[PDB]
Amino acid sequence: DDEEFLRYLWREYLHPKEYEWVLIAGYIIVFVVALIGNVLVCVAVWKNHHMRTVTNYFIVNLSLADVLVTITCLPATLVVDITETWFFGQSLCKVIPYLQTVSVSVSVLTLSCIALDRWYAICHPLMFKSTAKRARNSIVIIWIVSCIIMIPQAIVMECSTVFPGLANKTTLFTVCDERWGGEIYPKMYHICFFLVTYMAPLCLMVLAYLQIFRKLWCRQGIDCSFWNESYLTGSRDERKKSLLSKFGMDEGVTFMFIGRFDRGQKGVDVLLKAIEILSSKKEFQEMRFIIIGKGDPELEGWARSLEEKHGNVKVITEMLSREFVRELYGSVDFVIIPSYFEPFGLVALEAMCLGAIPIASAVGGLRDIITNETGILVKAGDPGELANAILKALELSRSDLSKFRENCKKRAMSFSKQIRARRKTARMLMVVLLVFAICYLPISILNVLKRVFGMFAHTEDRETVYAWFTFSHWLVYANSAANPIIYNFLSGKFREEFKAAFSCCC
Numbered sequence: 001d002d003e004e005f006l007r008y009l010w011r012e013y014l015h016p017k018e019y020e021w022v023l024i025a026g027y028i029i030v031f032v033v034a035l036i037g038n039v040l041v042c043v044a045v046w047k048n049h050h051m052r053t054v055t056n057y058f059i060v061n062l063s064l065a066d067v068l069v070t071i072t073c074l075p076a077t078l079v080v081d082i083t084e085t086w087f088f089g090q091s092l093c094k095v096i097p098y099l100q101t102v103s104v105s106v107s108v109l110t111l112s113c114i115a116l117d118r119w120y121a122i123c124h125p126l127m128f129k130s131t132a133k134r135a136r137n138s139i140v141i142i143w144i145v146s147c148i149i150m151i152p153q154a155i156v157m158e159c160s161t162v163f164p165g166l167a168n169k170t171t172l173f174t175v176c177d178e179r180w181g182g183e184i185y186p187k188m189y190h191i192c193f194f195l196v197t198y199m200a201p202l203c204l205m206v207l208a209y210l211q212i213f214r215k216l217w218c219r220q221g222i223d224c225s226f227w228n229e230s231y232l233t234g235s236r237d238e239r240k241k242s243l244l245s246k247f248g249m250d251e252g253v254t255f256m257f258i259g260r261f262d263r264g265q266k267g268v269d270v271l272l273k274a275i276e277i278l279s280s281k282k283e284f285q286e287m288r289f290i291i292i293g294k295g296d297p298e299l300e301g302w303a304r305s306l307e308e309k310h311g312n313v314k315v316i317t318e319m320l321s322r323e324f325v326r327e328l329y330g331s332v333d334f335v336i337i338p339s340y341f342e343p344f345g346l347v348a349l350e351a352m353c354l355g356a357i358p359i360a361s362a363v364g365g366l367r368d369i370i371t372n373e374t375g376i377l378v379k380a381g382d383p384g385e386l387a388n389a390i391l392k393a394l395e396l397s398r399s400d401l402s403k404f405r406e407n408c409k410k411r412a413m414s415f416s417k418q419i420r421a422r423r424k425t426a427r428m429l430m431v432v433l434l435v436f437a438i439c440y441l442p443i444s445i446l447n448v449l450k451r452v453f454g455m456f457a458h459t460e461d462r463e464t465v466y467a468w469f470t471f472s473h474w475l476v477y478a479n480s481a482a483n484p485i486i487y488n489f490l491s492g493k494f495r496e497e498f499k500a501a502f503s504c505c506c
């Protein structure tokens, strides 16, 4: 009667759309999934101390922004897309678009700081001393910048009431939309809006992740299935004696260098000078040197001269197969890596996997790999320091070295594990970036085409354009539901925490 009469009146007022059933269904699904998932992300990182990383701090910030828009903006957007009218008054006409755009800005700047942190950690040779307070300062900056830059958005939003009807106005409708005082202002503002919220951060993040991919996959990594001691037969003593026998050398503490002969990069000049220095001491007779490489013909001549002079020095300018090099690593006592510059100690990791104790310059990746219990670090470029470290290694070799070789093997495996873990994380972040870029493409392009280029002004098919806009709105909100699913599929820690959450209630 009376209650049915009022429902009837709004039905006569509001004209329904044929696709609103799937829109409502999709919004309800995205609402529940985004809410539950992002809440679980937050509680997973907050209640479990193993989740405390800078990346996960940024991920929590992203989930918070997403929860904000899911609770305060998604219902309003659904209602407006269904009814094409603003029922919530003037203040909410300001506030809700402000919250929405602020959350977009927070999201894109959070992804940007994620990309930047990974780039500094991976592509930059240095590392930040601060991790947690760095993330906190970044997050506060992100929110402050986001809230400030979207102030114009809130300023231009206005309620406007339109009175349809020929002569006497019996009905009206209020819309919430941007109010501009000219044709140039919306074009300029929405060009800037597209640049700041979508295009420029996307380009920067794509460049950063290209550099990160190139570093993590093409410039790093060691084939652990090949560089493995399981392929070696017999004990290390037997292999060393067989090696020295085949090389026409007496038994002794065996040092190996492998690399290009150059001046200022791989450091064979430092090694040859250190060998000349050691040649005057009696300990030199207890030592054997295997110098493998090619390059500078003057350094090749110097090395051959040392070989012709000393029976405990052998130089190999021939190209050796990887199986032979693996035999070398698994039988020599020490590998000498006197690089001036060494961004990735690949030789060091390959040698340590096979139990060879590295003696390396403290430069770059060698510093990252080698510790005081897994090798000997020397000042780069100093032949006297290198000779002293070689004498130190001889004195060490007078006793059992097996614990040092085991520490080298464990450290190399652990480093390879870190490399793989960083690869998995970078991959998850790249998927997140790709899904963000897809989810926000339609609305970004449609906003430019409407505001900057003025399309859809006099369109014959306005129903199609309105469907495209409602779809782009929903796709934006579905991004918030998609992120936790991504974390569950591409992160074993998030997956375990989600399983624990869903099991504590079942």
Ligand SMILES: CCN(Cc1cccnc1)C(=O)CN(c1ccc(OC)nc1)S(=O)(=O)c1ccccc1C
Pocket (backbone or CB within 6 Å): 073, 077, 080, 096, 097, 098, 100, 101, 104, 176, 177, 193, 197, 440, 443, 444, 447, 472, 473, 474, 476, 477
């Ligand atoms: C200028 C902002 N914009 C363009 C845009 C480009 C890229 C990312 N988000 C929005 C709009 O289309 C408008 N904005 C919007 C609309 C729907 C929606 O669904 C996710 N998200 C944002 S809005 O200004 O916040 C707005 C305006 C009027 C009523 C409600 C809302 C939320």
